[PDB]
Design a protein around this nucleic acid. Sequence first.
DNA 1: CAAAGGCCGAGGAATGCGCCCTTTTAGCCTTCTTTTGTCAATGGATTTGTG
DNA 2: CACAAATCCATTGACAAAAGAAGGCTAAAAGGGCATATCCTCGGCCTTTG
Lengths: 72, 1164, 52
Amino acid sequence: SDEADEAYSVTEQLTMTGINRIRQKINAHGIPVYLCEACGNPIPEARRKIFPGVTLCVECQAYQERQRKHYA
Amino acid sequence: EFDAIKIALASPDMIRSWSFGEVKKPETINYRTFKPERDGLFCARIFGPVKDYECLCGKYKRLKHRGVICEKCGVEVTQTKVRRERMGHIELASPTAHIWFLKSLPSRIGLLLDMPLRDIERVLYFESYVVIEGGMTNLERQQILTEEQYLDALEEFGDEFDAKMGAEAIQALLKSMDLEQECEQLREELNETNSETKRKKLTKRIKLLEAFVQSGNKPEWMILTVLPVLPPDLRPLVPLDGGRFATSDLNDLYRRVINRNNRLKRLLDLAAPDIIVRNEKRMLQEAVDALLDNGRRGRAITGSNKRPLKSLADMIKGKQGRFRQNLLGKRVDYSGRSVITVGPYLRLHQCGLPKKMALELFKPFIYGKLELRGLATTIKAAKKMVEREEAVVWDILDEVIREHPVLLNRAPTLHRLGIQAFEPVLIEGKAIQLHPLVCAAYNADFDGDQMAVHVPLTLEAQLEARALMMSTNNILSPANGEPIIVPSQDVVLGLYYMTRDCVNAKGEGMVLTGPKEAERLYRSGLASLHARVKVRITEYEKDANGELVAKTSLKDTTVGRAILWMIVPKGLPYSIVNQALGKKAISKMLNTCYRILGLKPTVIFADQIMYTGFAYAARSGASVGIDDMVIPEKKHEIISEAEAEVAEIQEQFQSGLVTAGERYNKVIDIWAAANDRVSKAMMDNLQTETVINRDGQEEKQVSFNSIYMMADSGARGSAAQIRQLAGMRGLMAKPDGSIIETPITANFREGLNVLQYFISTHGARKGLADTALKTANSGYLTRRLVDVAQDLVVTEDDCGTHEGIMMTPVIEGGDVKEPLRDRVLGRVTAEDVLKPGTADILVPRNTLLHEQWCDLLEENSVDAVKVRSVVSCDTDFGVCAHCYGRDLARGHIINKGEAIGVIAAQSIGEPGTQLTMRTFHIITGGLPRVADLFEARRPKEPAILAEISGIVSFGKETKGKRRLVITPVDGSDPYEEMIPKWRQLNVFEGERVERGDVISDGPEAPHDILRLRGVHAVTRYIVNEVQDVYRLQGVKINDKHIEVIVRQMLRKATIVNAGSSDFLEGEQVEYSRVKIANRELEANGKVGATYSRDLLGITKASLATESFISAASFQETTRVLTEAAVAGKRDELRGLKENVIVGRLIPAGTGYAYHQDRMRRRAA
Amino acid sequence: INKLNRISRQMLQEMGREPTPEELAERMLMPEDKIRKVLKIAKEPISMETPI
DNA sequence: CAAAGGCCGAGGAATGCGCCCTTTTAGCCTTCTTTTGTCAATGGATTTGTG
DNA sequence: CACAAATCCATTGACAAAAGAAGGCTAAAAGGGCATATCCTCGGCCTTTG
Ligand SMILES: [Mg+2]
Ligand SMILES: [Zn+2]
Ligand SMILES: [Zn+2]
Ligand SMILES: [Zn+2]
C-alpha cells in the first residue's frame, strides 16, 4: 500500500471527477435554438458556432453565473 | 458454573451482607510507616491482610496460623489477594438518592412516583417540602409545599400533616407506595381513559409498575442508606519511585464522602441549626453523586489537576472503561512481534520464525522437554540450560516446534485472514519471514511492516489452528469465493515474460517432443523462451464420472508456454497457458484448477506458480531504464494545437463572445482532450515494436518494452501512471475539487519546473491527508456491522421454508452487468427449476448450485431461479445451512455452527475499505453512502407509494398538499394522502392503481417499500443499491452477506391484531419471538396475532439486544444497567460477546457442541 | 512543612540559588536528619489515570 | 438640569498558612521468665567375634 | 551351634538461646485557648458638584 499509493488513488478520483463535471457542463452537441431563452434576443452567430446549443446570450449567461457564484 | 447472570437493586441489608466492615475514618495509610489504618479506606480488618498469611502488626507470621484473627490488630491472617475481593460499606447518616435512578432521562424514581423530575429535585436539594400521606386534611399526596407555605399550612394544623423535605421525603414517598394497588388503579383507568396521551402514558406507566413488581425490587432501594466500598486492590495507593505514590481518583471521591458523612454525624450530634444541617446534607448528596457518576450534576469535581476525577460509572464506561479495552482487548502472553521479510522459498503453510523469538515463546514447552528427556534434572537446571542457550536446547527447539502452528496477525484485522496459523520454520536473524502469496490477505508489504505471532497452547487450539485457520485452508476470500492466493508482481511478470511469444527468436518452428525437451532446449540455450514451436502435449481431461482420460496432440506454443505446462496439474486444459498470462489469466488459472481439482492440487499449483514466476522473472532480467519512457514525437504538435485552441478561446472571450466561467469550462475541456490525445499517442508508440523475421520483412509485434511489459502484464502499473511518466501530466485539482486550468504539459521523464511541481502539490497533499485519516477509522463499518450481526449463527441444518428470492440477472439498461450464474452460484434452490420446455425439472430442489448445476442452468437459458435467502429463513434464533448457502471461504456447504453474522460483517467491511472514503456524486458512491444505506435513513424526498389498491381519486384542493383517496374495487377507502403538488404526480385520477405503486417520483424510502411489498422487496432493494456502490468502484462482495445483515435489520415486529395471544397492540416485539408465540397459540385452540413487519437501521437494531452484558458493551453502560436493574433482568448468556466477556467459549465455533451439551443438561 | 517552606523561600532569595538541606538545618534549628525526612515526605501522590 | 466622582458590594487569584501549652498514644528499648534447641554422659539392647 | 566386645537407643544434667512479656520512657500525635477590628477589580449606586 505504501501510504502514497492510496493517496494516488484518492488524487486520481478527485481530479477525474472534477474534470468530468467541468466537461459535462459544456453540452457541445445540441439544438440550434437561435434565440435567447431569457430575453429572446438574437444569440449572435459566433456564440452559437463556438457553443453549439447555447440557451442564453452572454449577458444573461454572465448574470446567471453571478447568482450561481454566490449560491441558490 | 453459573449459566446465567442476574441483576437487581441492592438492598441496604444486602449491601451490609457483602460488607466485611464499615469504613469510618477517611485516612489511607500512615504517612510514616505506610501501614493501613484502623478504619481507613485501606484497612486490614475490613479488607484483609497486606502480606500473605501475616497479620498487620506481625504477631502471627505462620501459614499454620491460617484463618485465625489476630488479637492486637484484629487482622485475620489470610492471603492478601483476599483484599482484592472484600467490600466494605459506609453507614450514611442521611439517605442519598442514587444518581442513576434520578438523573437518568426517564428517571425511574420520577416516573415511578408519577412526579416531575424538577419537583423531586426540589424536594431533594431542600427547596420544598412534600406531602407524604397528610391524612384527610385536604392535603394532596406528593403535593409540594414551600417553606413559608409549609409553615402557614402547619398554622391551624397542629395535627400531624405529615410533610417532609429532602431525600428522606422521597424515601418515605417510595416506601409508602403500593405497587400492585397502583397497577390496579391504572388498569381501571386504562379501562376508561380511551384517549391517546392519557391511556398511552397509562399503559407506559403500568408497564414499569408491573415490572417493578416482578423484579423483586422494592421501590425505596433507590434511596441509598448504606454505601458499598470498592476493595482496596481495585483502587490502590501504590508507591512509585522515591517515596512517590500513585492513587486512584476513586480514593479521592471516597474520602470526600467519608469526610462529609462524618461531619454530618457531627452536626447532628451538635444540634446545629436547619441551615447548616441542610447544607451538609446537600453536600453529602453531591459527594455521593460525584462518587457514583461524576459529571451528571455539574460540574465534574477536579482533583489536584484541571481534569475531573474518574468514578465508578467512568470506571466501567468509556474506551478507558472495563468493557471497551479490558474486557475484549487484552495483553496476551506467549506472544511477540517482529519485522516481516519475504522468505520466498517457504511453502504456503509455513513462516520463518526467528530462533530467538521461538526460544522465548516456547519456553515452558522446552523446559518440559529438557526435564522429560533427562537433559535437565529439574526445571531450574533446564532454565539455566536454555538461558545459556546450550547445544541441546536447539535440538529440543526443533522437536517442540515440529508440528505446532503459530498465529500470524497484522494490526488492522479487517477480516479473518489477518490471522493465520503457519508452521514455524526456524531461521537465523530477527525478522519473521512471511510467504509472498499471503500478503494480499494480510495487506502487508515488506517495507517495514510488523507481525505479531501468538502461540496456541492447548491441543484444542493446536487443532483449531491446524484444522481451521491454517494458511492452506483459507485461500478463497470469504466475501467472494475467488481465490485469495493470486500471485502479485514478480510472479506475474515472470509468467508473462515466459508465456509471451515474439516473431523470430532462436529455434523458430522446431517441433519439440514435449515440455521436457523444450525445457532442455531452453536451458542449454539452444532455443529462446518465446520461440513459436510445435510441441506435443498430453493433457488429461476429467470428461467422465471423474475418470481423467488422457489426450495427446501437437499444439503451437512458445517454448515458455510448454516449459510452464510442466507445472500445471492433470485436470486442467492446455488453453489455460497458451496465451500471454497476465494477471487475470493467472487468477483464472488458479480458479479453474480449484473448480476442477480442489484444494490440495491448488495449493501445490500455487506454490509451483510462485516458484516458477520468481525464477523466470530473475532470468528475465527485466530492469527499468530512462530510455524505456518513450515520449511520443507528436506530443509538442498536439500541445501546440491545444495551446492555439485556448488562445483562440481567450481571444473570443476578450471580445465578449463568451463569459468567464464559460471560457473556463472551454479551456478545461481543451486541455483534457489534448491530454487524451497525448496519452493515446504515447501508448500506441509504446505498445508495439518492429522486428525481423523469417523471410526478412519487418513485422509488428507487441512491445517488449519494460515499463509497458510491467503495465500490460498486470504486474504493476497501468496506462495512467504510464501517461504521467512519458505522456503529459495533465490538469491538476485543488483540495476543493476545482481544477487548476494551467496544465502540467511535462512528464517525469522530462521534469516539472518549480511552478508545476508546486501545482501538483495541491492534489498530492489532499490525497495524502485523506489517506492518513481514512487509516484512522479504517474499521468503523466492520464494527458497526458486527454490533448487529454478531449473535447470528448457523444453528440448523434445514428450516424447510419454501420462501425464496428470485435471483435473476441485473440488466443495467443495456447488457447485463452481472449474470444469473454469478448471482446464483452456491445458493440452495427453493423450488423445482423447469426446463424452457416447461415440463422438465432441471434442478430439483435443495440442490447446492455448484458450477455443474450453474452451467446446466446457463445452458438451458433458465434466467430466473428461486433461491433460498437468509432473510426468508424460518429458523428461530439462528439460520439454517440451507437458507444460507455455501461457505465461499471453503468450497463446501456451510457447517452447522458457523458464526455467519461476524463473517458477513467483516466481508462487507473489509471490501469496503477499497471504496472511496468520501462520497462522490456522478449514483453517489464511497463508504459513507454504504453506511447510510445500512442505517436505513429516510430520504428527504420520498417517492410516495400507493398504500391501498383501488380506483384512484383526488379530493380537496391545496390544503398545503393536494389531497387524494384510493378506493378499492369493493372495499373501503379510509386511507387518503396529503400528496404535495410539489410531488408532481405520475398517474391521472382515472387510472385504477394497484396497491404498492408509485404516486410521485424520487428516492423510495425502504420502510415504505417493506410495508407495501414483501420483505423480499426490501431485501432486493437494499442489496441492489449497496451492490450498486460496490460495483461502482469495481469491488466484488456477495449478496449473502448483505442479506444476513438485512435479516438482522428487519428483526422487529409490530402487532396489529393481538389475537387470542398475550401481546399488546401498539407494541414492537422481537419477531423471532412473536413468530413462535403465534405458532404456539395457533397450535392450541386459539388463533395467532397478526403483525406488521418493521425495519431498523443497524445502529438502531443493534441497540435492541436480548442480553444486557452484551448491550452494555457498545451502548451507554449507564442507561442499560439502570434499566436492567429496575427490570430485574437475567442474562442467560446464549451469545458471542457475553461469553467473550464472561470468559467462556462462544456458541459460534467449536463452542457450539459445548453449549449444546450444556443445554442438554440444563433441560434435563 | 510550612515553616520549612517559609525559611526556604526566604533563604533562596537572600542566599542566591537555593538552600541545600545542610543550609536549612543550619538556618533552622533542626538536626538535618529531621529536615531530610520532612523533605522526603511525599506530596499529593497522583491520579493513576494520568496520561502517559 | 447631567457628570464626575466617592462609596460600597459582589467575585477572584494567590507572594496566601499559628502558636504556645497540656495530655494521651505508639513504639522502642531494656530486663527478666520460659519454651526450646544442644552437648556430654551413661548405661543398655542387637551385631559381631570367637571356636 | 555355644560364650564377651562393638554399637544403635533412649534418659539426665547442664544450659545457651530464642521467644515472648512486661515496665518504663520518650517523641509524636491530638486537643484546647486565644478577646481591637478588618486586598484588588469591577461595576452598580448614589452625593456632590456644577
Ligand atoms: Mg508497509
Ligand atoms: Zn439573452
Ligand atoms: Zn496483629
Ligand atoms: Zn431455513
